[PDB]
Design a protein around this ligand. Structure first.
Ligand SMILES: CC/C=C\C/C=C\C/C=C\C/C=C\C/C=C\CCCC(=O)OC[C@H](CO[C@@H]1O[C@H](CO[C@H]2O[C@@H](CO)[C@H](O)[C@H](O)[C@H]2O)[C@H](O)[C@H](O)[C@H]1O)OC(=O)C/C=C/C/C=C\C/C=C\C/C=C\C/C=C\CC
Ligand SMILES: CC/C=C\C/C=C\C/C=C\C/C=C\C/C=C\CCCC(=O)OC[C@H](CO[C@@H]1O[C@H](CO[C@H]2O[C@@H](CO)[C@H](O)[C@H](O)[C@H]2O)[C@H](O)[C@H](O)[C@H]1O)OC(=O)C/C=C/C/C=C\C/C=C\C/C=C\C/C=C\CC
Ligand code: CLA
Ligand code: CLA
Ligand SMILES: CC(=O)O[C@H]1CC(C)(C)C(=C=C/C(C)=C/C=C/C=C/C=C(C)/C=C2C=C(/C=C/[C@@]34O[C@]3(C)C[C@@H](O)CC4(C)C)C(=O)O/2)[C@](C)(O)C1
Ligand SMILES: CC(=O)O[C@H]1CC(C)(C)C(=C=C/C(C)=C/C=C/C=C/C=C(C)/C=C2C=C(/C=C/[C@@]34O[C@]3(C)C[C@@H](O)CC4(C)C)C(=O)O/2)[C@](C)(O)C1
Ligand SMILES: CC(=O)O[C@H]1CC(C)(C)C(=C=C/C(C)=C/C=C/C=C/C=C(C)/C=C2C=C(/C=C/[C@@]34O[C@]3(C)C[C@@H](O)CC4(C)C)C(=O)O/2)[C@](C)(O)C1
Ligand SMILES: CC(=O)O[C@H]1CC(C)(C)C(=C=C/C(C)=C/C=C/C=C/C=C(C)/C=C2C=C(/C=C/[C@@]34O[C@]3(C)C[C@@H](O)CC4(C)C)C(=O)O/2)[C@](C)(O)C1
Ligand SMILES: CC(=O)O[C@H]1CC(C)(C)C(=C=C/C(C)=C/C=C/C=C/C=C(C)/C=C2C=C(/C=C/[C@@]34O[C@]3(C)C[C@@H](O)CC4(C)C)C(=O)O/2)[C@](C)(O)C1
Ligand SMILES: CC(=O)O[C@H]1CC(C)(C)C(=C=C/C(C)=C/C=C/C=C/C=C(C)/C=C2C=C(/C=C/[C@@]34O[C@]3(C)C[C@@H](O)CC4(C)C)C(=O)O/2)[C@](C)(O)C1
Ligand SMILES: CC(=O)O[C@H]1CC(C)(C)C(=C=C/C(C)=C/C=C/C=C/C=C(C)/C=C2C=C(/C=C/[C@@]34O[C@]3(C)C[C@@H](O)CC4(C)C)C(=O)O/2)[C@](C)(O)C1
Ligand SMILES: CC(=O)O[C@H]1CC(C)(C)C(=C=C/C(C)=C/C=C/C=C/C=C(C)/C=C2C=C(/C=C/[C@@]34O[C@]3(C)C[C@@H](O)CC4(C)C)C(=O)O/2)[C@](C)(O)C1
Ligand SMILES: [Cl-]
Ligand SMILES: [Cl-]
Ligand SMILES: [Cl-]
Ligand SMILES: [Cl-]
Ligand SMILES: [Cl-]
Ligand SMILES: [Cl-]
Lengths: 151, 151
C-alpha cells in the first residue's frame, strides 16, 4: 500500500460517476483531437516514447496488468470497468507518472495540447454531466498533488 | 551483439526499399483497418496488453529507446528513418517478440486479423513497389525463424 493508492481511492470517489457517463465505445476516440497533423503528432508521440523509456519498468508492467484486469470487468451500456478496477488503473498510472521527471510529463502534455483543437474539451464535456466532469477534474487536481510528492 | 541483431541486418537489406516507399505521413494509419469495431478491437488491444505485461521490461525499454532515436533520423518526403535506425528498431522488436510465449504473439495476430478487412493488405501494397513489398515479406519470414529460435 502507498499514498498514491490512498489518493486513487479519493480520485475514484470524485471521478467514477463521470467515468460511467462516458461512452467508451464511441468511435470518435480513434480520430485526431482536431485536425490531423502528422508531423506535430509525431513530436507528441516522441515525448511519450521518451517518457515510457524513462518510466520504472516494474510500474509500467503493473499498469499494463491493471488495464488487462479492468477490461475483464467492463459492463453496462457504456463499456465502463468496475469501480475497483477504475481505482486500480488510476493508482497504477499515478505511480508511472511519479517515476519520471516532471519535465517529461509536462513535455507530453504541452505536445498533445499543440495538436488538440480548443473545441475538443468542451465537446467531450457536453456528452456527460458537466458537474460530474468538474468534480472529476477537481479530484484529479488533488490526486496529482499526491503524485508530485512521490516524484 | 546477438543473432536477432544479425538477422535484423538481413531483414533491413530485404525491407528498406519498401520502407522508403511507404508514405509514413499518410493520415490513413489513424483509421481502423476496415470497419470500426470497438468490442472486437478491445479484445485485440487486451491481447496486446497481456503480451506487453509479459515482455522483458529491459527489452521493452530498449525498443522504446530505438524508436526515439529512429524519430530523430527521419528524412525525405515520406518520413522514413535512416537505414541504421530501421535495422535497430527491427532487432529491438524481434527481441521483444522472442521474450514472450509464441501463443501471446499469435493471439495478437489472430485478434488483429479479425478486425482487418481483407482488402487492406492489397490496398497498402498498391501504394508501394509490389516486388519490394514481397522481398520485405520474404525477409520477414527469414527473420521470424531467427526470432523463434531465441523464443
Ligand atoms: C496511430 C497513433 C495511435 C494512437 C494515437 C495516439 C495518441 C492520441 C493523441 C491525442 C488524443 C489525446 C488527448 C486529447 C483528448 C482530449 C482532451 C483531454 C484533456 C482536456 O480535456 O483538458 C481540459 C483542460 C481544461 O483546461 C484547464 O481548465 C482549468 C479549469 O479549472 C478551474 O475551474 C474548474 C473547472 O471545472 C476546476 O475545478 C479548477 O479548480 C479551476 O482551476 C484550468 O484553467 C487549467 O489551467 C486548464 O488547463 O484543458 C487542458 O488541459 C489544455 C490541454 C489539453 C491537452 C490535451 C490532452 C492532455 C495531455 C496529455 C495526455 C497524454 C496523452 C494522451 C494520449 C494518449 C494516452 C496514452
Ligand atoms: C485508440 C487506439 C489507438 C490505436 C489503434 C491500435 C492498434 C491499431 C490496430 C490495427 C491496425 C494494425 C494492423 C492492420 C494493418 C495492416 C495489415 C498488415 C498485415 C498484412 O498486410 O499482412 C499480409 C498477410 C498476407 O497474407 C499472407 O500471405 C502469404 C503469401 O506468402 C506467399 O507468397 C509470397 C507473397 O509475396 C511470400 O514470398 C511467401 O514466400 C509465400 O508463403 C501467405 O499466404 C500467408 O499464409 C498469409 O498470412 O495477411 C495476414 O497476415 C492476415 C492477417 C493480417 C493481420 C493484420 C495485422 C498483423 C497482426 C498484428 C500486428 C500487431 C499489432 C498491430 C497494431 C499495432 C502495432 C503495435
Ligand atoms: C485499454 C484501453 C485503454 C483506453 C481506452 C485508454 C484510454 C485513455 N488513456 Mg490509457 N493506457 C492504457 C490503456 C487504455 N487507455 C494502457 C495499457 C496504458 C499503459 C499502462 C495506458 C497509459 C496511459 C497513460 C500514462 C495515460 C493514459 C491516458 C488515457 C486517456 C487519453 C485521452 C485523455 O486524456 O482523455 C481524458 C482522460 C480521461 C477521461 C481519464 C480520466 C482523467 C481524470 C482522472 C478524470 C477526468 C478529468 C477531466 C474531466 C478530463 C481530463 C483532464 C486532463 C487535463 C487531466 C484515455 C482516457 C492519459 C490521461 O488520462 O491523461 C489525462 C494518460 O496520461 N493512459
Ligand atoms: C514511433 C511511431 C511508431 C509508428 C509509426 C509505428 C508503426 C507500426 N508499428 Mg510500432 N512501435 C512503436 C512505435 C511506432 N510504431 C513503439 C514505441 C513500440 C514499443 C517499443 C512499438 C512496437 C511495435 C510492435 C511490437 C509491433 C509494431 C508494429 C507496427 C506496425 C503495425 C501495423 C502493421 O503491421 O503494418 C505492417 C508492418 C510494417 C509496414 C512494418 C515492417 C514489417 C516487415 C519487417 C516488412 C514488411 C512485410 C509486409 C510487406 C507487411 C507486413 C506483414 C505482416 C504479417 C508481418 C506499424 C508499421 C507491428 C508490426 O509491424 O507487425 C507486423 C508490431 O508487431 N510496433
Ligand atoms: C497497439 C497498442 O499498444 O495500442 C495501445 C496503445 C496505448 C497507448 C496503451 C492505448 C491508449 C490510449 C490512447 C491511444 C488514448 C487515446 C485517446 C484519444 C482521445 C481522442 C479524442 C477525445 C478525439 C476527439 C476528436 C474530436 C472531434 C471533435 C470535433 O470534430 C467534431 C466532432 C466536430 C467539429 O466541427 C468540432 C470538433 C469538436 C473539433 C473530439 O471531441 O474528441 C491503447 C488504447 O491501449 C492502445
Ligand atoms: C517501453 C515502452 O514501450 O513504453 C511505452 C509505455 C506506454 C505507457 C504504453 C506509452 C505511453 C504513453 C505515455 C508515456 C503517456 C504520457 C501521458 C502523460 C500525461 C500528462 C498529463 C495529463 C499532464 C498534465 C499536466 C497538467 C498541468 C496542468 C496545470 O499546469 C496548468 C496547465 C495550469 C496550472 O495553473 C495548474 C495545473 C493544473 C498544474 C495537466 O492537467 O495534465 C508508450 C509511448 O507507448 C511507450
Ligand atoms: C472501449 C472500452 O471499453 O474501453 C475501456 C478500457 C478500460 C481500460 C477497461 C477502461 C478504463 C479505464 C481508463 C481508460 C482509465 C484512464 C485513467 C487515466 C489516468 C491518468 C492519470 C492518472 C494521469 C496523470 C497525469 C498526471 C500528471 C501530474 C503532473 O503533471 C501535473 C498535473 C502537474 C505537474 O506540476 C506535476 C505532475 C505530477 C507531473 C497525474 O498525476 O496523473 C474503460 C473506462 O472501461 C474503457
Ligand atoms: C483500431 C481500433 O478500432 O481501435 C479501437 C481501440 C479501442 C480501445 C477499442 C478504442 C477506444 C477507446 C478510447 C481510446 C477511449 C478514449 C476516451 C477518452 C475520453 C476523453 C474524455 C471523456 C475527455 C473529457 C475532457 C473533458 C473536459 C472537461 C473540462 O475541460 C472543460 C471542457 C472545462 C472545465 O469545466 C474543466 C473540465 C471539467 C476539465 C471531459 O469532460 O471529458 C477505439 C476508439 O474503438 C478504437
Ligand atoms: C499514446 C501512445 O503511446 O501511442 C503510441 C502507441 C504505440 C503502440 C507505441 C504506437 C504504435 C503503433 C501503431 C498504433 C500502429 C498502427 C498502425 C495502423 C495501421 C492502419 C492501417 C494500415 C489502416 C488502414 C485503413 C485502410 C482503409 C482502406 C479502405 O477504406 C478505404 C481507403 C477504401 C475502402 O473502400 C476499402 C478499404 C481498402 C478497406 C487501409 O488500407 O489501411 C505509436 C504510434 O507509437 C503510438
Ligand atoms: C507495460 C506496457 O505498457 O507494455 C506496452 C508495451 C507496448 C509494446 C507499447 C504495447 C504493445 C503492442 C504489442 C504487444 C504488439 C504486439 C504485436 C504482435 C505482432 C505479431 C505478429 C506480426 C504475428 C504474426 C504471426 C504470423 C503468422 C504467419 C504464418 O502463420 C501463418 C498465417 C501461415 C503459416 O503458413 C506461416 C506463417 C508465416 C508462420 C505473422 O505473419 O505475423 C502495449 C499494448 O501498449 C503495452
Ligand atoms: C509519421 C512518421 O514519420 O513515423 C515514422 C516513425 C519511425 C519509428 C521513425 C519509423 C519507423 C520504423 C518502424 C515503424 C518500424 C516497424 C517495425 C516493425 C517490426 C515488427 C516486427 C519485427 C514484428 C515481428 C512479429 C514477429 C512474430 C514472429 C512469430 O509469429 C510468427 C511470425 C510465427 C510464430 O510461429 C513464431 C513467432 C516468432 C512468434 C517477429 O518475428 O517480428 C518511420 C518508418 O520513419 C515512420
Ligand atoms: C493523434 C495523431 O494524429 O496520431 C498520429 C500519430 C502518428 C505516429 C504521427 C501517425 C502515424 C503513422 C503510423 C501509425 C503508420 C503506420 C504504418 C503502417 C503501414 C503498413 C503497411 C505499409 C502495410 C502493408 C501490408 C502490405 C501487404 C502486402 C502483401 O500482403 C499482400 C497484399 C499479398 C502478398 O504479396 C504478400 C504481401 C507482400 C505480404 C504492404 O505492402 O504494406 C498518424 C497516422 O499520423 C497519427
Ligand atoms: Cl492502505
Ligand atoms: Cl495519509
Ligand atoms: Cl479546425
Ligand atoms: Cl556482430
Ligand atoms: Cl551466425
Ligand atoms: Cl466493408
Amino acid at each position: 500500500a502507498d499514498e498514491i493508492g490512498d489518493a486513487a481511492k479519493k480520485l475514484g470517489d470524485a471521478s467514477y460517476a463521470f467515468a460511467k457517463e462516458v461512452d467508451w465505445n464511441n468511435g470518435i476516440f480513434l480520430q485526431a483531437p482536431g485536425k490531423l497533423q502528422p508531423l506535430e503528432a509525431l513530436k507528441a508521440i516522441d515525448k511519450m516514447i521518451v517518457m515510457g523509456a524513462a518510466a520504472d519498468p516494474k510500474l509500467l508492467k503493473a499498469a499494463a496488468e491493471a488495464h488487462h484486469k479492468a477490461i475483464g470487468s467492463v459492463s453496462g451500456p457504456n463499456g465502463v470497468t468496475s469501480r475497483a478496477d477504475w481505482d486500480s488503473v488510476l493508482a497504477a498510472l499515478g505511480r508511472v507518472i511519479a517515476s519520471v521527471p516532471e519535465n517529461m510529463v509536462m513535455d507530453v502534455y504541452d505536445s498533445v495540447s499543440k495538436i488538440t483543437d480548443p473545441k475538443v474539451p468542451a465537446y467531450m464535456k457536453s456528452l456527460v454531466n458537466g458537474a460530474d466532469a468538474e468534480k472529476a477534474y477537481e479530484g484529479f487536481l488533488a490526486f496529482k498533488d499526491v503524485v508530485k510528492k512521490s516524484q
